[model samples]
Target: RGSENLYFQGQLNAMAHQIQEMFPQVPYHLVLQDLQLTRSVEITTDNILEGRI
Candidate 1:
Protein backbone atom coordinates (compact mmCIF):
# COMPACT_ATOMS: atom_id res chain seq x y z
CA ARG A 1 0.00 0.00 0.00
CA GLY A 2 3.12 2.20 -0.19
CA SER A 3 6.44 2.73 -1.93
CA GLU A 4 8.15 -0.60 -2.72
CA ASN A 5 11.60 0.87 -2.92
CA LEU A 6 13.83 -2.22 -3.31
CA TYR A 7 11.88 -3.89 -6.13
CA PHE A 8 12.20 -1.56 -9.09
CA GLN A 9 14.61 -0.18 -11.72
CA GLY A 10 15.78 3.21 -12.92
CA GLN A 11 14.29 6.33 -14.64
CA LEU A 12 10.57 5.33 -14.43
CA ASN A 13 10.93 3.67 -11.00
CA ALA A 14 12.15 6.86 -9.39
CA MET A 15 9.28 8.65 -11.09
CA ALA A 16 6.66 6.63 -9.23
CA HIS A 17 8.38 7.05 -5.88
CA GLN A 18 8.73 10.73 -6.54
CA ILE A 19 5.06 11.25 -7.32
CA GLN A 20 3.84 9.27 -4.31
CA GLU A 21 5.87 11.39 -1.93
CA MET A 22 5.24 14.74 -3.61
CA PHE A 23 1.69 15.16 -4.90
CA PRO A 24 -0.80 14.06 -2.32
CA GLN A 25 -4.17 12.35 -2.87
CA VAL A 26 -5.84 14.70 -0.47
CA PRO A 27 -6.20 18.45 -0.94
CA TYR A 28 -3.42 20.63 0.41
CA HIS A 29 -2.26 24.24 0.58
CA LEU A 30 1.30 25.47 0.15
CA VAL A 31 3.46 27.72 -1.99
CA LEU A 32 3.75 25.94 -5.33
CA GLN A 33 7.34 26.68 -6.18
CA ASP A 34 11.02 25.93 -5.71
CA LEU A 35 10.85 22.24 -4.85
CA GLN A 36 14.39 20.83 -5.03
CA LEU A 37 13.73 17.52 -3.28
CA THR A 38 14.02 15.12 -6.25
CA ARG A 39 12.92 17.40 -9.06
CA SER A 40 11.21 20.68 -9.79
CA VAL A 41 7.43 20.41 -10.28
CA GLU A 42 4.78 22.59 -11.91
CA ILE A 43 1.30 21.92 -10.53
CA THR A 44 -1.95 23.76 -10.00
CA THR A 45 -5.24 22.89 -8.31
CA ASP A 46 -7.15 22.78 -11.55
CA ASN A 47 -10.60 21.56 -10.44
CA ILE A 48 -11.45 23.75 -7.51
CA LEU A 49 -15.25 23.42 -7.77
CA GLU A 50 -14.99 19.62 -7.76
CA GLY A 51 -12.18 19.14 -5.24
CA ARG A 52 -8.41 19.24 -5.93
CA ILE A 53 -8.02 22.97 -5.33
Candidate 2:
Protein backbone atom coordinates (compact mmCIF):
# COMPACT_ATOMS: atom_id res chain seq x y z
CA ARG A 1 0.00 0.00 0.00
CA GLY A 2 2.79 2.38 0.85
CA SER A 3 4.95 1.84 -2.19
CA GLU A 4 2.73 2.44 -5.24
CA ASN A 5 5.63 1.56 -7.53
CA LEU A 6 5.51 -2.12 -6.48
CA TYR A 7 3.25 -3.00 -3.57
CA PHE A 8 -0.10 -1.60 -4.77
CA GLN A 9 1.04 -1.78 -8.39
CA GLY A 10 0.71 -5.56 -8.23
CA GLN A 11 -2.63 -7.47 -8.12
CA LEU A 12 -4.44 -4.50 -6.50
CA ASN A 13 -3.71 -1.88 -9.15
CA ALA A 14 -6.14 -3.76 -11.35
CA MET A 15 -8.84 -3.14 -8.78
CA ALA A 16 -8.17 0.57 -8.87
CA HIS A 17 -7.69 0.58 -12.61
CA GLN A 18 -10.93 -1.27 -13.32
CA ILE A 19 -12.95 1.20 -11.28
CA GLN A 20 -11.70 4.25 -13.15
CA GLU A 21 -12.13 2.54 -16.51
CA MET A 22 -15.92 2.61 -16.16
CA PHE A 23 -16.28 6.36 -15.51
CA PRO A 24 -14.44 9.53 -14.55
CA GLN A 25 -12.81 8.95 -11.18
CA VAL A 26 -9.77 9.57 -9.07
CA PRO A 27 -6.49 7.66 -8.84
CA TYR A 28 -4.58 7.24 -5.60
CA HIS A 29 -1.10 8.46 -4.74
CA LEU A 30 -0.96 7.16 -1.18
CA VAL A 31 -3.04 4.00 -0.55
CA LEU A 32 -4.30 1.67 2.13
CA GLN A 33 -1.02 1.34 4.04
CA ASP A 34 -2.35 -0.30 7.22
CA LEU A 35 -5.00 -2.44 8.83
CA GLN A 36 -7.38 -1.49 11.65
CA LEU A 37 -5.57 0.53 14.26
CA THR A 38 -7.91 0.34 17.28
CA ARG A 39 -8.28 -3.40 16.80
CA SER A 40 -4.59 -3.74 15.94
CA VAL A 41 -3.51 -6.53 13.54
CA GLU A 42 -0.03 -7.16 15.00
CA ILE A 43 -1.54 -8.37 18.25
CA THR A 44 -3.73 -10.90 16.49
CA THR A 45 -1.44 -12.12 13.71
CA ASP A 46 2.06 -11.89 15.20
CA ASN A 47 1.71 -15.31 16.85
CA ILE A 48 -0.38 -16.78 13.96
CA LEU A 49 -0.82 -20.13 15.76
CA GLU A 50 -2.26 -22.16 12.92
CA GLY A 51 -1.75 -25.22 10.67
CA ARG A 52 0.82 -26.11 7.98
CA ILE A 53 3.68 -25.29 10.28
Candidate 3:
Protein backbone atom coordinates (compact mmCIF):
# COMPACT_ATOMS: atom_id res chain seq x y z
CA ARG A 1 0.00 0.00 0.00
CA GLY A 2 2.80 2.37 0.83
CA SER A 3 4.56 1.81 -2.46
CA GLU A 4 1.28 2.07 -4.30
CA ASN A 5 0.58 5.39 -2.68
CA LEU A 6 3.98 6.64 -3.72
CA TYR A 7 3.32 5.63 -7.31
CA PHE A 8 -0.04 7.29 -7.22
CA GLN A 9 1.50 10.49 -5.93
CA GLY A 10 3.96 10.41 -8.79
CA GLN A 11 1.10 9.95 -11.21
CA LEU A 12 -0.66 12.93 -9.70
CA ASN A 13 2.45 15.07 -10.20
CA ALA A 14 2.56 14.12 -13.86
CA MET A 15 -1.12 14.90 -14.25
CA ALA A 16 -0.68 18.19 -12.47
CA HIS A 17 2.10 19.20 -14.81
CA GLN A 18 -0.10 18.55 -17.82
CA ILE A 19 -2.83 20.69 -16.35
CA GLN A 20 -0.41 23.39 -15.34
CA GLU A 21 0.74 23.64 -18.92
CA MET A 22 -2.73 24.48 -20.10
CA PHE A 23 -3.78 26.49 -17.09
CA PRO A 24 -0.70 28.00 -15.59
CA GLN A 25 -2.81 30.29 -13.41
CA VAL A 26 -4.17 27.39 -11.41
CA PRO A 27 -2.21 26.31 -8.40
CA TYR A 28 -0.30 23.04 -8.75
CA HIS A 29 -1.50 21.83 -5.37
CA LEU A 30 -5.12 22.42 -6.32
CA VAL A 31 -4.63 20.61 -9.59
CA LEU A 32 -2.99 17.70 -7.78
CA GLN A 33 -5.79 17.45 -5.23
CA ASP A 34 -8.39 17.57 -7.97
CA LEU A 35 -6.55 14.84 -9.82
CA GLN A 36 -6.49 12.74 -6.68
CA LEU A 37 -10.26 12.96 -6.43
CA THR A 38 -11.25 12.78 -10.11
CA ARG A 39 -8.36 10.65 -11.44
CA SER A 40 -9.09 11.94 -14.97
CA VAL A 41 -7.33 14.84 -16.62
CA GLU A 42 -10.36 15.62 -18.75
CA ILE A 43 -12.66 15.76 -15.77
CA THR A 44 -10.17 17.76 -13.77
CA THR A 45 -9.93 20.27 -16.59
CA ASP A 46 -13.68 20.54 -16.74
CA ASN A 47 -13.87 21.05 -13.01
CA ILE A 48 -11.27 23.79 -13.16
CA LEU A 49 -12.90 25.56 -16.03
CA GLU A 50 -16.37 25.28 -14.55
CA GLY A 51 -15.13 26.45 -11.17
CA ARG A 52 -16.29 23.21 -9.60
CA ILE A 53 -12.93 22.67 -7.96
Candidate closest to the true structure, highest TM-score: 3
Candidate 1 total steric clashes: 0
Stretches of model 2 off by over 4 angstroms after superposition = 1-9, 28-53
lDDT of 1 at 27: 27
Candidate 3, 1-53: lDDT as tens digits: 99999998898899999999999999999999989899999999999999986
**In candidate 1, what are the lDDT values of residues 1-53, reduced to their tens digit?**
23543332233344434544655663232312212222223333233223533
Query: Candidate 3, which segments miss by more than 4 Å at Cα?
Result: none
Give all candidates' CA lDDT scores: 0.35, 0.32, 0.93
The parts of candidate 1 lying over 4 Å away from their true place are 1-9, 24-53
Worst 10 residues of 2 by lDDT: 29-38
Better of 1 and 2 by lDDT: 1
Worst 10 residues of 3 by lDDT: 7-16
Number of backbone collisions per candidate, in order? Answer: 0, 0, 0
TM-scores of all predicted structures = 0.26, 0.29, 0.87
